[PDB]
């Protein structure tokens, strides 16, 4: 099971948000918070990143580019997971220090992201998703978004998405002895992949405006964190970096 092994031994441990709890909530303080851990998640990301099998064969600006393009959608999945497996989904887990409540969610004003990205948190427990199967899909997410127009290296990143949706398709919980079982199984986390997208497109709109307009609502957002929104999450929001689907919207 060398795969799997490789993908358990470099998922990520607990990552704190450094939020004060013992304060009342407010738009600025959660907001901040949450870009001070969008931060420190992406420290993280690029360290699992290049990690990942095969990853270092992608051209070196590809790999920077896949991971601040993948970089939301990629946060977002692992998030529900969290609040999967530590609240049942009944809260949004963002960091040990950093879980939402409803009031959170309506102080923070994004409530309707937060809603869309509990649904998918549920999904988990209504599909009785594996950690084995959530470790290949999240995996497979890193490698779906790329600029319309290519990457430097095509070919690479061809090869490797193939090999992790091969890798996903031998760890689909499913009876083997029934055709249909692994059909279905496969169908429907392809289908719950693609519903990472949008919700990843409408946290990127979110972070996008917020940027602009940081300085008159008082939110911080650190060094790593404002390059990326401001310089690959418009050629995403422009259209000029699409996620890749597996089944037409
Ligand atoms: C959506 C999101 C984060 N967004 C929410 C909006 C904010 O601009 C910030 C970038 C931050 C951290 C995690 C985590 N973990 C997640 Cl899931």
Redesign the pocket.
């Given at each position: 099971p060398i795969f799997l092994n490789v993908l358990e031994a470099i998922e990520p441990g607990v990552?704190c948000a450094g939020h004060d709890n013992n304060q009342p909530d407010s738009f600025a303080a959660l907001?901040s918070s949450?870009?001070e851990?969008?931060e420190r998640?992406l420290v993280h990301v690029v360290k699992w990143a290049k990690a990942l099998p095969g990853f270092r064969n992608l051209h070196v600006d590809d790999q920077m580019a896949v991971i601040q393009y993948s970089w939301?959608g990629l946060?977002?999945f692992?998030?529900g997971w969290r609040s999967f497996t530590n609240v049942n989904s009944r809260m949004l887990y963002?960091?040990p220090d950093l879980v939402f409540n409803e009031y959170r969610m309506h102080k923070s004003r994004?409530y309707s992201?937060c809603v869309r990205?509990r649904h998918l948190s549920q999904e988990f427990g209504w599909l009785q998703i594996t950690p084995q199967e959530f470790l290949c899909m999240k995996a497979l997410l890193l490698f779906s978004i790329i600029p319309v127009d290519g990457l430097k290296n095509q070919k690479f990143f061809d090869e490797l998405r193939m090999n992790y949706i091969k890798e996903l398709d031998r760890i689909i919980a499913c009876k083997r002895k029934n055709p249909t079982s692994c059909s279905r199984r496969f169908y429907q986390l392809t289908k719950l992949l693609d519903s990472v997208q949008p919700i990843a497109r409408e946290?990127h709109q979110?972070?996008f405006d917020?940027l602009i307009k940081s300085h008159m609502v008082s939110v911080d957002f650190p060094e790593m964190?404002a390059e990326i929104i401001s310089v690959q999450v418009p050629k995403i929001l422009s259209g000029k970096v699409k996620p890749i689907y597996f089944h037409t919207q």
């Open positions: 990552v907001l949450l870009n851990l969008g998640q939301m946060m977002v692992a998030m963002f960091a994004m992201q990205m946290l979110f972070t917020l964190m």
